[PDB]
Amino acid sequence: GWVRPDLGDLSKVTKVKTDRPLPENPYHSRARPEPNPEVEGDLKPARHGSRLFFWTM
Amino acid sequence: MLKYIIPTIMLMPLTWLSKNNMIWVNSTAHSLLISFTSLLLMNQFGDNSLNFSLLFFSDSLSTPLLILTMWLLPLMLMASQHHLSKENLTRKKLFITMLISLQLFLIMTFTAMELILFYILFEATLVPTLIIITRWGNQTERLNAGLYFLFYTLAGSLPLLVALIYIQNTVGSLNFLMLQYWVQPVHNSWSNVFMWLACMMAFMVKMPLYGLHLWLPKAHVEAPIAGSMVLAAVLLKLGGYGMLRITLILNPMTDFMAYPFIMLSLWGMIMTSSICLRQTDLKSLIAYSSVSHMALVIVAILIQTPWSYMGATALMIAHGLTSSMLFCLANSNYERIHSRTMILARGLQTLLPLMATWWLLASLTNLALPPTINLIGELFVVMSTFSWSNITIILMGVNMVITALYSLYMLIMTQRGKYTYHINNISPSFTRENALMSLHILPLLLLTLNPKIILGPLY
Numbered sequence: 001g002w003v004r005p006d007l008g009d010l011s012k013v014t015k016v017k018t019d020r021p022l023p024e025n026p027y028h029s030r031a032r033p034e035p036n037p038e039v040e041g042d043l044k045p046a047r048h049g050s051r052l053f054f055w056t057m
Numbered sequence: 058m059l060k061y062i063i064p065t066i067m068l069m070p071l072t073w074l075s076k077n078n079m080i081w082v083n084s085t086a087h088s089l090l091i092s093f094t095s096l097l098l099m100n101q102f103g104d105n106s107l108n109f110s111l112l113f114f115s116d117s118l119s120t121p122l123l124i125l126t127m128w129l130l131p132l133m134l135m136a137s138q139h140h141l142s143k144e145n146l147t148r149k150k151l152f153i154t155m156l157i158s159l160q161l162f163l164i165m166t167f168t169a170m171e172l173i174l175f176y177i178l179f180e181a182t183l184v185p186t187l188i189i190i191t192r193w194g195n196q197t198e199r200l201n202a203g204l205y206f207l208f209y210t211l212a213g214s215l216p217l218l219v220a221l222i223y224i225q226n227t228v229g230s231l232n233f234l235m236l237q238y239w240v241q242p243v244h245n246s247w248s249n250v251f252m253w254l255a256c257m258m259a260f261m262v263k264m265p266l267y268g269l270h271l272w273l274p275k276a277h278v279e280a281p282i283a284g285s286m287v288l289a290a291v292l293l294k295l296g297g298y299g300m301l302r303i304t305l306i307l308n309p310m311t312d313f314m315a316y317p318f319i320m321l322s323l324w325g326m327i328m329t330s331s332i333c334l335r336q337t338d339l340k341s342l343i344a345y346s347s348v349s350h351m352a353l354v355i356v357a358i359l360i361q362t363p364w365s366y367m368g369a370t371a372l373m374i375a376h377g378l379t380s381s382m383l384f385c386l387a388n389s390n391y392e393r394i395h396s397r398t399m400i401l402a403r404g405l406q407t408l409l410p411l412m413a414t415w416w417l418l419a420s421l422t423n424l425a426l427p428p429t430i431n432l433i434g435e436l437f438v439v440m441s442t443f444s445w446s447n448i449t450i451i452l453m454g455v456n457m458v459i460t461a462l463y464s465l466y467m468l469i470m471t472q473r474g475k476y477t478y479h480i481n482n483i484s485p486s487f488t489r490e491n492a493l494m495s496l497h498i499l500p501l502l503l504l505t506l507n508p509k510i511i512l513g514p515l516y
């Protein structure tokens with residue numbers, strides 16, 4: 001009773017129903033470095049301007 | 058200071074938009090008006106300086122230097138308009154523009170609060186001064202003189218820029234008012250020894266210090282009259298003014314770092330005074346007299362006493378008017394005989410009786426006859442130098458003796474004796490020349506009535 005698969009049948013992507021659990025860390029990664037703190041807040045003008053030597057703006 | 062900066066800038070349009078034959082009249086009239094308003098800077102208080110804004114301030118050190126600067130501009134214009142008579146019109150307007158821009162840089166130099174703003178204008182004064190000497194000088198050697206002037210200055214100025222920038226990194230500010238309160242002592246170390254030299258050697262070259270002076274007699278012999286007036290009257294005093302400011306942050310290292318420079322000055326003033334006795338060029342003689350007078354100013358600044366700074370301020374003002382007057386007097390002779398040799402034209406009191414009076418008055422101030430402000434400045438420096446070390450009175454006394462010797466030698470050689478037979482083009486003194494001399498001497502003698510206004514912040 002074996003039927004031969006048609007053209008394109010065996011290149012299909014199928015779903016597999018398995019009791020095996022999904023691995024958590026397949027790459028054995030270490031802990032990622034913590035990100036740099038994200039700067040937040042209202043952007044205000046520079047205090048007394050550029051402050052380059054004698055410039056007052 | 059805008060009430061002085063803006064009108065000074067307006068002199069440029071005035072000259073350029075003036076009718077072809079009114080450039081000297083218009084610039085002279087309105088530069089005199091600016092000099093008049095400069096007296097409003099005399100609003101000085103006992104405790105606090107006059108601080109206008111974040112950029113400019115005026116104390117009793119800068120105020121007399123500002124008034125001398127703005128007074129000198131109209132005087133420079135009168136002195137220049139005769140030897141520039143044949144100059145091209147547009148080149149006349151460019152000559153006046155160089156002088157106006159020199160005044161602009163000078164008044165902002167003497168009033169800048171911050172030392173970097175002072176440095177930039179302190180250096181900006183080179184460009185106009187160099188251009189005047191080299192473009193409008195008379196002889197071949199004006200090109201070498203411009204180069205020695207430029208590179209002597211910069212060889213000292215560039216280390217100063219590095220030192221000033223380093224000071225702002227460590228102190229956090231170069232504002233002079235701020236430095237008065239955040240000044241910290243300078244301890245011994247080779248890093249501080251070179252910081253001291255970097256801060257001081259640019260100003261030493263401007264004074265000039267003995268040893269580093271050989272550029273000055275070159276510039277004076279080659280500059281046009283207006284160049285020599287500003288160079289002697291004001292530009293030399295940039296070095297003294299900067300020293301009186303920057304020594305604030307160099308203590309106590311000045312206690313021992315000053316020794317090599319006091320010895321150069323004390324001995325240098327005797328050497329340069331004696332050189333004046335054997336000079337053949339009248340302009341070179343007057344040049345070498347400035348080196349001698351400014352040696353006293355260097356010593357006074359370096360010993361740091363209330364009397365020495367008061368004497369230092371009076372000398373810089375007194376010297377400025379006297380040296381400028383002497384250059385004008387010699388130039389008036391030059392405009393006739395077209396030579397700077399002192400022995401060429403003799404016995405001129407016979408032919409120009411009133412100009413011999415100006416020669417006499419200028420010589421009497423130059424040798425510091427009392428009670429001229431020339432002597433008030435000299436005496437205060439001698440009083441303080443005596444307390445520094447009693448032996449200095451010997452060097453100080455010798456210099457006064459020699460100072461009188463060449464001052465009257467120059468008067469006797471050019472004005473007295475028999476006139477030179479073959480020089481027959483000595484015209485009567487012009488009203489322009491007589492007014493030029495009187496506008497030097499009359500303020501100089503008037504200041505003996507109210508000498509406090511030139512004694513400086515420690516009065």
Ligand SMILES: CCCCCCCCCCCCO[C@@H]1O[C@H](CO)[C@@H](O[C@H]2O[C@H](CO)[C@@H](O)[C@H](O)[C@H]2O)[C@H](O)[C@H]1O
Nearest residue numbers: 244245246247248249250251254313314315316317318
């Ligand atoms: C016109 C040129 C004029 C030139 C004037 C020359 C001035 C000469 C100043 C000599 C003193 C220099 O500054 C001197 O430096 C060293 C820093 O290394 C300091 O001394 C310090 O370091 C040295 C390292 O050799 C140690 O020996 C010493 O134990 C330590 O205290 C001195 O306490 C200080 O006095």
